[PDB]
Write an enzyme that holds these catalytic residues in place. Sequence first.
Site, PDB file in Angstrom:
ATOM      1  N   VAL A 180       0.851  -1.178   0.000  1.00 27.88           N
ATOM      2  CA  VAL A 180       0.000   0.000   0.000  1.00 27.88           C
ATOM      3  C   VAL A 180       0.898   1.244   0.000  1.00 27.88           C
ATOM      4  CG1 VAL A 180      -1.778   1.303   1.361  1.00 27.88           C
ATOM      5  CG2 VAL A 180      -1.872  -1.172   1.113  1.00 27.88           C
ATOM      6  N   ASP A 227      27.575 -13.371   7.145  1.00 30.82           N
ATOM      7  CA  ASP A 227      26.388 -13.056   6.352  1.00 30.82           C
ATOM      8  C   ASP A 227      25.906 -11.650   6.608  1.00 30.82           C
ATOM      9  OD1 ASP A 227      24.363 -13.383   4.527  1.00 30.82           O
ATOM     10  OD2 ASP A 227      23.063 -14.580   5.858  1.00 30.82           O
ATOM     11  N   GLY A 229      11.911 -14.535   3.846  1.00 25.49           N
ATOM     12  CA  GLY A 229      11.581 -13.212   3.502  1.00 25.49           C
ATOM     13  C   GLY A 229      11.920 -12.158   4.551  1.00 25.49           C
TER      14      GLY A 229
HETATM   15 CA   LIG Z   1       3.661   1.149   2.031  1.00 30.52          CA
END
Ligand SMILES: [Ca+2]
Length: 222
Positions: A57, A84, A174
């Site tokens: 959004v 990492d 993710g």
């Molecule tokens: Ca946003």
Amino acid sequence: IVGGYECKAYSQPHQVSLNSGYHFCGGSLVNENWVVSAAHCYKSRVEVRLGEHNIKVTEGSEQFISSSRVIRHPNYSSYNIDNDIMLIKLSKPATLNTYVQPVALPTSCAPAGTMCTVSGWGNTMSSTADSNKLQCLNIPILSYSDCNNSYPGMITNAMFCAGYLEGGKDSCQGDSGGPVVCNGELQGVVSWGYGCAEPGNPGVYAKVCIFNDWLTSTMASY
Ligand SMILES: [Ca+2]
């Protein structure tokens, strides 16, 4: 983030999304010009999206800034996911405001038992938690002994484990590259784990405190 909650207003203003046509990794703003993420998230150029809460959004708080440099730690090793950590230079400075604020890099390491906060837009493994709205989770640092016991011989000086060996609460796919904040400073970067939120398989995080001299000297080469 599995087992967390939607982050409250104003709360993780250092969190960024790395974008290459889609969100693929998190990161943390550490000053107006630089982001810290995970080396396994490397791409030669990335768009850094700051000021995000819902990545799907346009809320009016966002800044989208292309990288000018993407720098993996020189000793990153993919076979074992060692070292990492990566620096991303923004092509123009971020504007610091209500929604966009840096997190400090610690020179001291947080001990076992410290309660920290991890955040991201990764999988929630939940029917009602929306991964597009930034998720937050409180996780404690595990002992070295428990970390190594979980993943024998796989834990290097550049890693720590945090979470719950009982399962149910963890970072995930993710969330990589995003922050673990302890006492207000960036102790960890989301790195790896076997599955997400499985018993006996805690999250493994890059140990930011032992990289301070690499981080600061790299950023100082203006
Ligand atoms: Ca946003």
